[PDB]
Design an enzyme around this catalytic site. Structure first.
Site: not given
Ligand code: 8G2
Length: 340
Positions: A156, A158, A161, A174, A191
């Site tokens: 994850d 990005k 985060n 996260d 994402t």
């Protein structure tokens, strides 16, 4: 291959495995905390700023609604998130301080980082200079070296985060898609702008997807926008799988070269996934000015220090409708969440 790094990682794995095999459970309860503010909200959970009533310490409490977790097929993911977070220990990972559950919800009580998300700062500033992007990127490289050595994939990466702390360093938050994976895994998650081609194409994929995502992150930090941008996901996915990326003329040659090797569609040729592993990245010219040990020890002066007034300041986060934390009189989904 430095015996130093080898011995560091061997100890890291020993310590992780001990906690992985015997996870902590039920280490606080909801009425130990006062609710302050909603910091984020999603389809199955929220993050709430809370204050511990006895110590006065502030925490970011992630509250997951068990029924919505079930409906959106996130059971195993939420169990992964908590089991991993309670077992890891690294300077650039947000710390899980407590966890517990009640009739309705799961709770992960994390250290609160008041400086805000990288996303906000990047959008506010437009783009980061290469030194500024490199400072953050180096922290992610070390974090992935740590996680991957434990057989963990993050999945994850990005800007939203990556929280900026009081010293200007990153704290990754996260772990909702993080998973312990020896070999391959198959779940479609992450994402759109950050997805590696092999995820889009429904392959069994490995830790190379994190290195691809680092390429996307570095590009976005240095350009101000991501490399495969388009208006709708399907159009993003066509760009990702195409093997074509355009670089701004202001990018250095070293940056373009690193990015071509991270944003390598052929996962078997991608930096971070070759025989030399992370050292192909750490030894790249773009990182020639980086003292990896000094970054790890937090001895490098950061590019900036977020502005905030104290540990309870929420000014770097945005405003959400404040909804109840209702706890049912009847236990929901007890079987599914027994191990939490
Ligand atoms: C340690 O976690 C936090 O401090 C935090 C996490 C998530 C958000 C909102 N995306 C805000 C704050």
């Amino acid at each position: 291959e430095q015996e130093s790094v080898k011995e560091f990682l061997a100890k890291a794995k020993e310590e992780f495995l001990k906690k992985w095999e015997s996870p902590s459970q039920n280490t606080a309860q909801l009425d130990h905390f006062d609710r302050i503010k909603t910091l984020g909200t999603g389809s199955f959970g929220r993050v709430m700023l809370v204050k511990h009533k006895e110590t006065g310490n502030h925490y970011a409490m992630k509250i997951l609604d068990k029924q919505k977790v079930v409906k959106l097929k996130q059971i195993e993911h939420t169990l992964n998130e908590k089991r991993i977070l309670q077992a890891v220990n690294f300077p650039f990972l947000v710390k899980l301080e407590f966890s517990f559950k009640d009739n309705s919800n799961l709770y992960m009580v994390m250290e609160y980082v008041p400086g805000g998300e990288m996303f906000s700062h990047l959008r506010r500033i437009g783009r980061f200079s290469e030194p500024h992007a490199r400072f953050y990127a180096a922290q992610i490289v070390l974090t992935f070296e740590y996680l991957h050595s434990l057989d963990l994939i993050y999945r994850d990466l990005k800007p939203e985060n990556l929280l900026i702390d009081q010293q200007g360093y990153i704290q990754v938050t996260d772990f909702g898609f993080a998973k312990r994976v020896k070999g391959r895994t198959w779940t479609l998650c992450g994402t759109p702008e950050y997805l590696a081609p092999e995820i889009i194409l429904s392959k069994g994929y490995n830790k190379a997807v994190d290195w691809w995502a680092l390429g996307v992150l570095i590009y976005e930090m240095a350009a101000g926008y991501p490399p495969f941008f388009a208006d709708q996901p399907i159009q993003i996915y066509e760009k990702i799988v195409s093997g074509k990326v355009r670089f701004p003329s202001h990018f250095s040659s070293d940056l373009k070269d690193l990015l071509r090797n991270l944003l390598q569609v052929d996962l078997t040729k991608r930096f971070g996934n070759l025989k030399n592993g992370v050292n192909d990245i750490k030894n790249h010219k773009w990182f020639a000015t980086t003292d990896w040990i000094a970054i790890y020890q937090r001895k490098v002066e950061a590019p900036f220090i977020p502005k905030f007034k104290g540990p309870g300041d929420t000014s770097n986060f945005d405003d959400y409708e404040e909804e109840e934390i209702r706890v049912s009189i009847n236990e929901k989904c007890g079987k599914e969440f027994t191990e939490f």
